Ligand binder design. Sequence first.
Ligand SMILES: Nc1ncnc2c1ncn2[C@@H]1O[C@H](COP(=O)(O)OP(=O)(O)O)[C@@H](O)[C@H]1O
Ligand SMILES: Nc1ncnc2c1ncn2[C@@H]1O[C@H](COP(=O)(O)OP(=O)(O)O)[C@@H](O)[C@H]1O
Ligand SMILES: [K+]
Ligand SMILES: [Mg+2]
Ligand SMILES: [Mg+2]
Lengths: 366, 368
Amino acid sequence: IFINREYLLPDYIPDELPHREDQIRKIASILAPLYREEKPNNIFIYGLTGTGKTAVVKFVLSKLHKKFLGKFKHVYINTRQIDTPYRVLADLLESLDVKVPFTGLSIAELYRRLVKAVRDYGSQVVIVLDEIDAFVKKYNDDILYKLSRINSEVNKISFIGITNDVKFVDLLDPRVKSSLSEEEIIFPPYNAEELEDILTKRAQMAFKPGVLPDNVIKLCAALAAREHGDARRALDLLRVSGEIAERMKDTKVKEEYVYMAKEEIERDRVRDIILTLPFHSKLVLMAVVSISVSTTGAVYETYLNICKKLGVEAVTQRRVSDIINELDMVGILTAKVVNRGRYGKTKEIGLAVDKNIIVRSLIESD
Amino acid sequence: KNPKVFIDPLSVFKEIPFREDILRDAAIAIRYFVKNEVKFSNLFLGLTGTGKTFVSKYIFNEIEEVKKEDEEYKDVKQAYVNCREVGGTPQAVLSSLAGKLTGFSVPKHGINLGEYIDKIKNGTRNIRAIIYLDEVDTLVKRRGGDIVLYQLLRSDANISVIMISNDINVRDYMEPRVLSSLGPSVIFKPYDAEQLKFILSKYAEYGLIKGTYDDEILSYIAAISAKEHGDARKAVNLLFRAAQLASGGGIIRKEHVDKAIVDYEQERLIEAVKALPFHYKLALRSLIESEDVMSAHKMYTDLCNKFKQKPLSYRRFSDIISELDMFGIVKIRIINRGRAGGVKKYALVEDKEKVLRALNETFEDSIS
DNA sequence: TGTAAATTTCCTACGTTTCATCTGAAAATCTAG
DNA sequence: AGATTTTCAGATGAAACGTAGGAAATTTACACT
Ligand SMILES: Nc1ncnc2c1ncn2[C@@H]1O[C@H](COP(=O)(O)OP(=O)(O)O)[C@@H](O)[C@H]1O
Ligand SMILES: Nc1ncnc2c1ncn2[C@@H]1O[C@H](COP(=O)(O)OP(=O)(O)O)[C@@H](O)[C@H]1O
Ligand SMILES: [K+]
Ligand SMILES: [Mg+2]
Ligand SMILES: [Mg+2]
């Protein structure tokens, strides 16, 4: 059925990145100075998720690393996967050939050791910070200024910032924006047609003979194209599709398998999410279930009911009015602020996900 | 009724029923280490009492026998270290390894952790060495624990590592580096009723005495355990109770088992508190007469004073509590009250009444 | 001089609850020829 | 009708809360030279 699914994991990195021709150009052009050992311009990359951001960059740096071969360091660090100011600065201080103890140091004195690692480093270095959203979200903006001031307060390194929403550029009050928007690329979501190309070039390395109909790929593409031109969707949707036509022990793939995949993927997206939900958030959701196109009011009502049947003190309606919205973002519920003259101003609330996946997992925790 | 089997199975059992594949696949990977200089790392996952520990001890233990006999193994050093038993700390763990591998003169404190890895290379400088890490889920949960393993697995001194964790999700606790450079994970599926009934029938065979155990009753226990549970340590030690008790005539009936069960669930709590770091006990009593943590800490600082002993900081106290909750002894509540000045930590003593009895008993026996 | 781990010392930001202010079109009332 | 006045049912804002918990600082115990 397959001969390497690995050609479909969001790890593997391809020979060419179709349709990211301008994005690659613009970068390796705006990084050129590295060849004569001269600090390039700081880049700031935004675009949705699965638009190529992480891909392009990790690939352009692997190309310049060889083209130049020149002394030149780059460190790719995912702020999401790090989740702690210590860890970020602990690798940064490992990549410069510096050793830091696991404990004993503290942020402040950590930047100190870092300013030393730079002024002692004779190799121009590019720092990649992926998904900064994450590590500015539930941490401080600080790391930026303090990293800005760092190459600045002793004469050099260069940065590449990759985030997801336009709204993030707004958080850069200080020179943080002035010194990062030096170069500012955008990664538009892919076209369905674009997404077909990308899928076919990776499919021919993955599957077997005519194990995979053209027809499968065009819809696999057009499905994900409809949900924010996401390249990672188009790929999972396909891989799984294959894995599914695998456990159903046959050596082909059917349109029926892809729709199958799609749902299966939700299940796990949501099951994960729902599992890591506050006992109280699980609770508000539960009510919305037993009600199944209702109003914030009726929800709080059936909320108090379960706290009662359970012996677990309720919560303010005020907390529930937002705990709702919160489940909106996660994409489990859908709540809109309607305006109805004498029927008041509610949140019309309803289920985005299936009802079963919402309970089986729900029970998986209690 | 012939106890030797029931506390040292590795001495009786010359094989492990329903784990043959696990055992072979290992001795293979090892022979390929010795004859091929090819490194390998594995992660044994599984619920408790599925033979994780037992298997390992057996690999290790049989290889001790093998280098004696073979000779081409003559030159292979083994270290078996229990990340929980030692401290859980990297420093603690690294010290132990460098203990056996090097020779055994080794500091526990004061040294830079790298100079443990430096020490290990020197003690196995070409000469092949194998590592076992029972409950490595402790080491990993601590700062730099996976950042240790990575420098082990992927370092120079040709060393093959075996990691047996007790927490299954132990990967989500592991850094990409580590997980990436990690070998295959080997999962011990819990036993079913049939598997258990055979295992028991083996133990029954060795330890016990013909007649005293029929077939239905072995079937009985396996039925009991197996059904969502798994766990063989209970299954074996469960027989033991109903065994102890049935010294009557004796025939061993459904009774002997039932009691053996209550006998086991409640007797657990006893030593579960008996062996509880000194201040923990004092803390624990604090809680039984006040669920309010800040309030408990006061009657804590009292008992310490009364036993001429420095009371610990409330911070360290709230932890010992939080930590008692990870133990399943108490249950933390946390009540939040907006404009009404909320945020108070609370703690419930599971049985309150049972625990107290055990606490009293423990303090009292430790005076005579 | 040093390091790793355990505990103490510092300090606030966290998840709410309470109090207070807004919202916006439906419907029920009024308006005047 | 058209033009108002309510009237509903919850949204949206803001303050007050006081310690639980995270991060720095100190202590503990050593090691090496
Ligand atoms: N133009 C492209 N060609 C091939 N693969 C792509 C392309 N754009 C995205 N991908 C794929 O999407 C997956 C993850 O996408 P990624 O570029 O990391 O998105 P982002 O970094 O924007 O979240 C990777 O496996 C990568 O192969
Ligand atoms: N397959 C088996 N054969 C014989 N005895 C077993 C078997 N599985 C478990 N036991 C007994 O039950 C105990 C529990 O297994 P253990 O080695 O503790 O695994 P884990 O480390 O996962 O708890 C063992 O020490 C052993 O005495
Ligand atoms: K204090
Ligand atoms: Mg990415
Ligand atoms: Mg074990």
